[PDB]
Amino acid sequence: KAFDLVVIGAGSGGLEAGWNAATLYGKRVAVVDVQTSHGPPFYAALGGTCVNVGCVPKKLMVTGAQYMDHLRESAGFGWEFDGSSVKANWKKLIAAKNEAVLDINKSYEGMFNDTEGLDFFLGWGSLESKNVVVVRETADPKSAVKERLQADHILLATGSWPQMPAIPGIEHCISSNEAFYLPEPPRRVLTVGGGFISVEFAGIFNAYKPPGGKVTLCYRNNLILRGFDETIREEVTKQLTANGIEIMTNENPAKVSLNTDGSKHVTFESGKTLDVDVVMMAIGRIPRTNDLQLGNVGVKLTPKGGVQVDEFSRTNVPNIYAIGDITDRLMLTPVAINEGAALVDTVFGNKPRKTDHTRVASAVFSIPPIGTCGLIEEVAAKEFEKVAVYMSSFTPLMHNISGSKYKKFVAKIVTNHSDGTVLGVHLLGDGAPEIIQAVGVCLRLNAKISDFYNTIGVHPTSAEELCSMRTPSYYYVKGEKMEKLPD
Amino acid sequence: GSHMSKAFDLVVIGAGSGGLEAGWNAATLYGKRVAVVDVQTSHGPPFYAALGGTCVNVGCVPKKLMVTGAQYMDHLRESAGFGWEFDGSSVKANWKKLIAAKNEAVLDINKSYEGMFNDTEGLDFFLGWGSLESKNVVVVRETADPKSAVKERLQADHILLATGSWPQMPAIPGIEHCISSNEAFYLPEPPRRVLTVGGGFISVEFAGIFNAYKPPGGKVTLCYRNNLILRGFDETIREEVTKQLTANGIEIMTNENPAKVSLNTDGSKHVTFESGKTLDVDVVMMAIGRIPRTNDLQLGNVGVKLTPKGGVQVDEFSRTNVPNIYAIGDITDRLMLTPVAINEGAALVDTVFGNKPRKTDHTRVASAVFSIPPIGTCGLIEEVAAKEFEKVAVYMSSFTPLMHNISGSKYKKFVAKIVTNHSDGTVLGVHLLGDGAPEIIQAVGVCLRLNAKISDFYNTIGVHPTSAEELCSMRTPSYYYVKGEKMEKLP
Ligand SMILES: Cc1cc2nc3c(=O)[nH]c(=O)nc-3n(C[C@H](O)[C@H](O)[C@H](O)COP(=O)(O)OP(=O)(O)OC[C@H]3O[C@@H](n4cnc5c(N)ncnc54)[C@H](O)[C@@H]3O)c2cc1C
Ligand SMILES: Cc1cc2nc3c(=O)[nH]c(=O)nc-3n(C[C@H](O)[C@H](O)[C@H](O)COP(=O)(O)OP(=O)(O)OC[C@H]3O[C@@H](n4cnc5c(N)ncnc54)[C@H](O)[C@@H]3O)c2cc1C
Ligand SMILES: CC1=Nc2ccc(Cl)cc2[C@H](c2ccc(C)cc2)N1CCCN(C)C
Ligand SMILES: CC1=Nc2ccc(Cl)cc2[C@H](c2ccc(C)cc2)N1CCCN(C)C
Ligand SMILES: [Br-]
Ligand SMILES: [Br-]
Ligand SMILES: [Cl-]
Ligand SMILES: [Cl-]
């Protein structure tokens, strides 16, 4: 049939837009995805990347990995139990995660089936013409058409996909996709990449690895988590090392060979070599545009392969929109959901709305985790004459007792020292992702450092640290780091 | 001949949250000469509080350490949903190790504060009992008995009363067989059966502590003379906390109040309630309230007025009716929180010795209850708001988070409620129940001070997946109050 809206990708942005157009605006909506539930072959499915092979299962898996620390840290508080009897049962973790995600998948299929004007189609969506979306049996554009759907408006929301550098032996590497489904936890694992997916998985593998296992994270440059606070980048490196992960910086895989026993022989540019059981590539994610046959309608793509869009998510083709990771901007679920919601409000509501991509709070579920919102100081120092940095870094007391003395909580506030405006807030330590959330609200309210400092703390918490800092630890004046102001 | 009393700009009586903040600030920021008096240099019996105050010694610090210990009961159990396997029959909660570790941690804090006296010019510690001999004289005596030997007589230009509060022990037959939180911190063994009397945070929190470390066959019961524990808190939370305590094995006796306590021949306590009901327990912990500790200060020597409920009466700037005599923290019987005593102390010193007169804002103070799971709260509860504003909106989110479907603790509903003035969207109160509530709430305190509106919460992009993001995905009230009266839709 014909629809007010055809959504290609039943994911975070897609389902927001679909649901809202159907239920808030009474529109006739079609949503297409390649799989109704999670896992191989296509990994992402109804619900999106986040639901199936993204935020949801990884958070459960990190939650899982945290018990490594919990069991050990209990002793400090008088918990006694046979430490030798402890086993991290990965099969059980994945089965529980699988079931949890399947319930979300099922619960998305229910909502299609219960909601009028919102119909879901199985298969591969592509652009046949301006107002025509074809549904094929496979990603092969030569595969059998299942449906041809006329659409007043077409939304592209196909997310992203692991980027696999074209080094020899790349086919012996897995991405995050396959990591969610490993039948056994790897004894030795290389995670390639210094970004959050590699860091998060290195923490998960570290907790579930068999006896004598080793997790190694490698990263091509000097310091992992580029784009994050630098004190936090250094400190999380120390804390991952402290919990037995090897971080190989300035290293990059040049070749992966398959050993006959199924293990991988990794050769680095340096000529260094490492043998692991699993090489997980987590060096980036790229917009998922190949399969859309955008050539058919001339929808422009940026150098990076992302669908170009303006602030209202319009592509160059009128009635054709793109939101979410396909647009290659901020790759976060709540950003994609917001874009989706705003798009529907502009196309079917009376008031345009554009997503604000600044001051977005985000988290790394590393162990220990990171919460951050707004500018890191080096970016701050480039756009503001006077930047002040308030920093606190204390091993919390519970951790002196737990035995995890390396677990410093880091709290940094970055300000425009000229007016006191908070430019960004950066945290490392348990609760960092929870803490940062309302920080994000504060920045929308042009919070100044005196607003944080004059708020009464909640005690005892790590969070109160943010309401306890009134003197900068150091400044940037004209891009220049210095402990004191000049004059 | 005669010789000179040690003289100070400021004498602080009570080396606690409030006193130390004031003491330190007057000395290190305004170069004042500051005496601080407390009755013990380190934690524990006989006087329990000590250098560092209630918080350090027998309050926030040791209780948080103990709640953290208590949380492992839940972690060890919940770990199994995530594939952790171990021999659950080898599991034992060793209370003595908990308390020994907690004692070491508190002792390092005590030592650390003593070093800080030792190292800081113009900031002097005096061990003993502080009382007001006259308007500008603080005497320090050997014991709380106003007839014990005067150890030191201090000349003081300004006197800060910062003696905190103390547990209220109801005048019942056999009160002497009961304890307070003070003693809970030093019990040589974990009680097998305990009654925590009180519906407020300290009873709720210690109920969870006792519950986690109690020996085999133990039972923790909490009683409260009223209908619903945690008066002052959001009602959905109060009822959820009650359910989640029960789910965790704590017996909640509401509408019950002890009338007397007798010692059984085996040394256990036989509690009879007003209603005739009875309970035997090993420990009865009274946590029905804390009262301002005004009794030993001999305030009648200088005529410092008490409120009819017994705090030192102060104005917004912490002044008593007596010039140069001030009072901050629990002695004023306002909000009994550490960061508030601290805020009062700094604001007092700024006003008296700095050039920055300032008063504490006692509204929109975030606070926490370390139940398991905890409560994080800031600002007005809806029933209070409804009395002050014509249109109140309530936005509420509730649900067992996913991790807890997998962990198995499905009773563990996260509750998030935002209370607004519906006439301009201004957030009046935010109320959280669930893991990390205390951490979440802190920046929410900053939001309230910036007069955030629900539209600012809603406009903010969620951090995913967190519990906190619930606060930024609520756009439509669950219900309203329209002049006092609840309804799901406006008229
Ligand atoms: C391992 C990992 C961890 C992550 N963690 C977080 C996190 O903690 N927090 C956070 O905010 N973000 C996280 N992300 C990012 C988040 O998953 C994405 O930002 C988000 O899912 C993007 O939503 P989307 O709507 O752009 O696309 P998606 O949610 O990816 O949806 C794309 C959908 O389109 C479907 N599709 C693709 N091609 C076609 C086709 N041609 N026809 C029909 N259907 C098609 C796919 O099957 C998929 O279901 C994580 C990502 C990964 C990979
Ligand atoms: C079990 C428990 C748990 C608590 N948990 C928290 C929590 O999690 N968060 C929070 O914010 N608050 C908590 N509180 C409250 C917090 O401890 C108090 O609000 C705060 O300590 C009050 O500060 P203060 O300066 O008024 O007094 P205090 O810190 O109590 O200090 C008063 C000091 O005066 C000394 N003193 C008393 N009389 C004399 C005398 N005549 N001469 C010399 N010295 C004297 C005492 O020995 C004491 O050290 C808790 C309290 C209790 C009892
Ligand atoms: C508003 C909304 N937004 C979404 C954004 C991203 C994802 Cl991955 C999912 C949603 C869900 C949702 C649920 C079912 C359908 C068919 C579409 C969207 N959804 C519906 C919310 C369910 N509600 C009853 C509590
Ligand atoms: C500013 C301040 N406020 C307090 C409020 C309540 C308490 Cl319990 C403690 C403090 C501490 C403190 C510690 C020791 C002394 C002698 C004074 C103040 N304190 C000083 C902290 C020292 N700082 C340099 C790490
Ligand atoms: Br009571
Ligand atoms: Br009541
Ligand atoms: Cl396994
Ligand atoms: Cl890399």
CSV table of N, CA, C and O in Angstrom, one decimal, chain A residues 10 15 31-48 51-52 101-110 112-113 120-124 146:
chain,number,residue,atom,x,y,z
A,10,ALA,N,13.8,-0.2,11.7
A,10,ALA,CA,13.0,-0.2,13.0
A,10,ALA,C,13.9,0.0,14.2
A,10,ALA,O,13.9,-0.8,15.1
A,15,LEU,N,11.9,3.9,15.2
A,15,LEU,CA,10.7,3.6,16.0
A,15,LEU,C,10.1,4.8,16.7
A,15,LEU,O,8.9,4.8,16.9
A,31,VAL,N,7.2,0.7,8.6
A,31,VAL,CA,8.5,0.6,9.1
A,31,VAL,C,9.1,-0.7,8.7
A,31,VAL,O,8.5,-1.8,8.8
A,32,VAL,N,10.3,-0.7,8.2
A,32,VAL,CA,10.9,-1.9,7.6
A,32,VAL,C,12.2,-2.2,8.3
A,32,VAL,O,13.0,-1.3,8.6
A,33,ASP,N,12.4,-3.5,8.7
A,33,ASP,CA,13.6,-3.9,9.2
A,33,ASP,C,13.9,-5.3,8.7
A,33,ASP,O,12.9,-6.0,8.2
A,34,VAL,N,15.1,-5.7,8.8
A,34,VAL,CA,15.6,-7.0,8.2
A,34,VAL,C,15.3,-8.2,9.0
A,34,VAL,O,15.5,-9.3,8.5
A,35,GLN,N,15.0,-8.0,10.3
A,35,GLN,CA,14.9,-9.2,11.2
A,35,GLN,C,14.0,-8.7,12.3
A,35,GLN,O,14.1,-7.5,12.7
A,36,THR,N,13.1,-9.6,12.8
A,36,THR,CA,12.2,-9.2,13.8
A,36,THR,C,12.9,-9.5,15.2
A,36,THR,O,12.5,-8.9,16.2
A,37,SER,N,13.9,-10.3,15.3
A,37,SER,CA,14.5,-10.5,16.6
A,37,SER,C,16.1,-10.6,16.5
A,37,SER,O,16.7,-10.8,15.4
A,38,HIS,N,16.8,-10.5,17.7
A,38,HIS,CA,18.2,-10.3,17.7
A,38,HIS,C,19.0,-11.4,17.2
A,38,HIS,O,18.7,-12.6,17.4
A,39,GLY,N,20.2,-11.1,16.7
A,39,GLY,CA,21.3,-12.1,16.6
A,39,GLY,C,21.6,-12.4,15.2
A,39,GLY,O,21.1,-11.7,14.3
A,40,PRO,N,22.5,-13.4,15.0
A,40,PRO,CA,22.8,-13.8,13.6
A,40,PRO,C,21.5,-14.2,12.9
A,40,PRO,O,20.6,-14.6,13.5
A,41,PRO,N,21.5,-14.0,11.5
A,41,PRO,CA,22.5,-13.4,10.7
A,41,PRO,C,22.7,-11.9,10.8
A,41,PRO,O,23.8,-11.4,10.5
A,42,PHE,N,21.7,-11.1,11.0
A,42,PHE,CA,21.8,-9.7,10.7
A,42,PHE,C,22.0,-8.8,12.0
A,42,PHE,O,22.2,-7.5,11.9
A,43,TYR,N,22.0,-9.4,13.1
A,43,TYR,CA,22.4,-8.8,14.4
A,43,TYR,C,21.4,-7.8,14.9
A,43,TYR,O,20.6,-8.1,15.8
A,44,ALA,N,21.4,-6.6,14.4
A,44,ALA,CA,20.4,-5.6,14.6
A,44,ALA,C,19.1,-6.1,14.1
A,44,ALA,O,19.1,-7.0,13.2
A,45,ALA,N,18.0,-5.7,14.7
A,45,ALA,CA,16.7,-6.2,14.3
A,45,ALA,C,15.7,-5.2,14.8
A,45,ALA,O,16.1,-4.1,15.1
A,46,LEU,N,14.4,-5.6,14.8
A,46,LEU,CA,13.4,-4.8,15.3
A,46,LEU,C,13.8,-4.3,16.7
A,46,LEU,O,14.3,-5.0,17.5
A,47,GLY,N,13.6,-3.0,17.0
A,47,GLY,CA,14.3,-2.4,18.2
A,47,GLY,C,15.5,-1.6,17.9
A,47,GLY,O,15.8,-0.6,18.6
A,48,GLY,N,16.3,-2.0,16.9
A,48,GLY,CA,17.5,-1.2,16.5
A,48,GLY,C,18.8,-1.8,17.1
A,48,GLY,O,18.8,-3.0,17.6
A,51,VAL,N,18.9,-1.9,21.2
A,51,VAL,CA,18.2,-2.9,21.8
A,51,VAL,C,18.9,-4.3,21.6
A,51,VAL,O,18.9,-5.1,22.5
A,52,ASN,N,19.4,-4.5,20.4
A,52,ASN,CA,19.8,-5.9,20.0
A,52,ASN,C,21.2,-6.2,20.2
A,52,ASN,O,21.6,-7.2,20.7
A,101,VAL,N,16.7,-9.6,25.8
A,101,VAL,CA,16.6,-8.9,24.5
A,101,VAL,C,15.4,-9.5,23.6
A,101,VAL,O,14.6,-8.7,23.0
A,102,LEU,N,15.3,-10.8,23.5
A,102,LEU,CA,14.2,-11.4,22.8
A,102,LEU,C,12.8,-10.9,23.4
A,102,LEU,O,11.9,-10.6,22.6
A,103,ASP,N,12.7,-10.7,24.7
A,103,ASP,CA,11.5,-10.1,25.3
A,103,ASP,C,11.2,-8.7,24.8
A,103,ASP,O,10.1,-8.4,24.5
A,104,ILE,N,12.3,-7.9,24.7
A,104,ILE,CA,12.1,-6.6,24.1
A,104,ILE,C,11.7,-6.7,22.6
A,104,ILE,O,10.8,-6.1,22.2
A,105,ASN,N,12.4,-7.6,21.8
A,105,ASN,CA,12.0,-7.9,20.4
A,105,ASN,C,10.5,-8.2,20.4
A,105,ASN,O,9.8,-7.7,19.5
A,106,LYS,N,10.1,-9.1,21.3
A,106,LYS,CA,8.7,-9.6,21.2
A,106,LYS,C,7.7,-8.5,21.6
A,106,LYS,O,6.6,-8.4,21.0
A,107,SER,N,8.2,-7.6,22.4
A,107,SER,CA,7.4,-6.6,23.0
A,107,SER,C,7.3,-5.5,22.0
A,107,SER,O,6.4,-4.7,22.1
A,108,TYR,N,8.2,-5.5,21.0
A,108,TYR,CA,8.1,-4.5,19.9
A,108,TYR,C,7.2,-5.0,18.8
A,108,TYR,O,6.5,-4.3,18.2
A,109,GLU,N,7.3,-6.3,18.6
A,109,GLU,CA,6.3,-6.9,17.6
A,109,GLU,C,4.9,-6.8,18.1
A,109,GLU,O,4.0,-6.5,17.4
A,110,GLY,N,4.6,-7.0,19.4
A,110,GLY,CA,3.3,-6.8,20.0
A,110,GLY,C,2.8,-5.4,19.6
A,110,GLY,O,1.7,-5.3,19.0
A,112,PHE,N,3.5,-3.3,17.3
A,112,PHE,CA,3.1,-3.1,15.9
A,112,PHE,C,1.7,-3.7,15.7
A,112,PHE,O,0.8,-3.1,15.2
A,113,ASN,N,1.6,-5.0,16.2
A,113,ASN,CA,0.4,-5.7,16.1
A,113,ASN,C,-0.8,-5.1,16.8
A,113,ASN,O,-2.0,-5.3,16.3
A,120,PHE,N,4.7,-3.0,10.2
A,120,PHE,CA,6.1,-3.4,10.1
A,120,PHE,C,6.2,-4.3,8.9
A,120,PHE,O,5.5,-5.3,8.8
A,121,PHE,N,7.3,-4.1,8.1
A,121,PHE,CA,7.6,-5.0,7.1
A,121,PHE,C,9.0,-5.7,7.2
A,121,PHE,O,10.0,-4.9,7.5
A,122,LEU,N,9.0,-7.0,7.1
A,122,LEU,CA,10.3,-7.7,7.1
A,122,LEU,C,11.0,-7.7,5.7
A,122,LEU,O,10.4,-8.1,4.7
A,123,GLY,N,12.3,-7.3,5.7
A,123,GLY,CA,13.1,-7.4,4.6
A,123,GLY,C,14.0,-6.1,4.4
A,123,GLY,O,14.0,-5.2,5.3
A,124,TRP,N,14.6,-6.1,3.3
A,124,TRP,CA,15.6,-5.0,3.1
A,124,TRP,C,15.0,-3.9,2.3
A,124,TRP,O,14.7,-4.0,1.2
A,146,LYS,N,9.6,-8.0,-2.1
A,146,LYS,CA,8.5,-8.5,-1.2
A,146,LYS,C,7.3,-7.5,-1.2
A,146,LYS,O,6.2,-7.9,-1.1
